[PDB]
Amino acid sequence: WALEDFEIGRPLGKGKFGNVYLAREKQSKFILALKVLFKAQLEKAGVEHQLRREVEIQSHLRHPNILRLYGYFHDATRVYLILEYAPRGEVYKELQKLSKFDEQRTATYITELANALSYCHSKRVIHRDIKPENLLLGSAGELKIADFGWSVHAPSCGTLDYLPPEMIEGRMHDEKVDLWSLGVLCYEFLVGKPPFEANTYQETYKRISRVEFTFPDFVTEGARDLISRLLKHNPSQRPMLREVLEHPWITANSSK
Numbered sequence: 701w702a703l704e705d706f707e708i709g710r711p712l713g714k715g716k717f718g719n720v721y722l723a724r725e726k727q728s729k730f731i732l733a734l735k736v737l738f739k740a741q742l743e744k745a746g747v748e749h750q751l752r753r754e755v756e757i758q759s760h761l762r763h764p765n766i767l768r769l770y771g772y773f774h775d776a777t778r779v780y781l782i783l784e785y786a787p788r789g790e791v792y793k794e795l796q797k798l799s800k801f802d803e804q805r806t807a808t809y810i811t812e813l814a815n816a817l818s819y820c821h822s823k824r825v826i827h828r829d830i831k832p833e834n835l836l837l838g839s840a841g842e843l844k845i846a847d848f849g850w851s852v853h854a855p856s857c858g859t860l861d862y863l864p865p866e867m868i869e870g871r872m873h874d875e876k877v878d879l880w881s882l883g884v885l886c887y888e889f890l891v892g893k894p895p896f897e898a899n900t901y902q903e904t905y906k907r908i909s910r911v912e913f914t915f916p917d918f919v920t921e922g923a924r925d926l927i928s929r930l931l932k933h934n935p936s937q938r939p940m941l942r943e944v945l946e947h948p949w950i951t952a953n954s955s956k
């Protein structure tokens with residue numbers, strides 16, 4: 701695999717630590733997304749074990765709702781990451797443009813996530829980094845999990861918003877950590893922003909540690925219940941996916 705097997709299209713993103721361009725595999729005209737990385741910024745951060753370890757995990761996962769990593773290859777000074785391309789764009793931007801999502805749209809995204817996660821929780825992998833900007837949209841408008849920068853094996857410093865008390869209180873945690881994010885996320889899908897939002901890192905900790913959230917009046921009781929069930933402080937109180945997938949509100953509003 702050489703960078704000359706591909707035809708770079710329009711840029712879709714920037715980082716940290718390279719760029720993501722549209723691209724067409726020359727011989728098969730196969731459309732995809734290609735992530736670039738400079739070995740320079742790589743060792744300058746030393747996170748090379750992660751890249752190898754993250755690419756490691758993602759490369760061995762199969763799900764309609766999990767963005768696929770076909771392959772990769774490095775050259776003179778670059779690292780190349782051959783990724784599945786998501787036509788409809790990023791869920792984050794969408795939320796930005798619409799402000800929030802009606803119950804039907806929210807309820808379905810959750811159902812798709814629940815499966816993708818139910819799946820990960822059986823391959824013994826925990827995402828832990830579920831957040832809008834980690835979600836993209838398939839051409840059919842369906843949800844796709846994109847990043848694995850953290851996702852680890854278990855039972856086992858950035859944005860504190862989607863992390864549960866255990867993660868934050870440096871405590872011992874497991875697969876139920878993702879069920880807390882699903883709650884937070886659900887809330888954001890419906891409210892327009894996270895439950896434990898704060899102008900300061902410090903005070904978010906407090907809001908999250910003490911599980912302090914309230915709903916806007918417009919939030920329906922069907923939702924409030926689910927979210928509340930999902931945002932239980934004690935990881936054991938956190939329901940299990942099946943139950944989530946089979947919650948009244950979920951069923952009464954989902955497409956799947």
Ligand SMILES: O=C(O)c1ccc(Nc2ncc3c(n2)-c2ccc(Cl)cc2C(c2c(F)cccc2F)=NC3)cc1
Pocket residue numbers: 712713714715720733735767783784785786787788789790833834836846847848
């Ligand atoms: O603006 C539009 O109209 C638009 C934007 C994007 C798409 N599609 C798309 N499909 C697949 C990927 C990406 N984007 C993508 C794009 C940019 C960047 Cl900075 C990262 C990635 C990723 C990614 C990743 F590796 C880690 C974490 C998150 C990721 F999102 N990986 C594949 C369609 C339309």
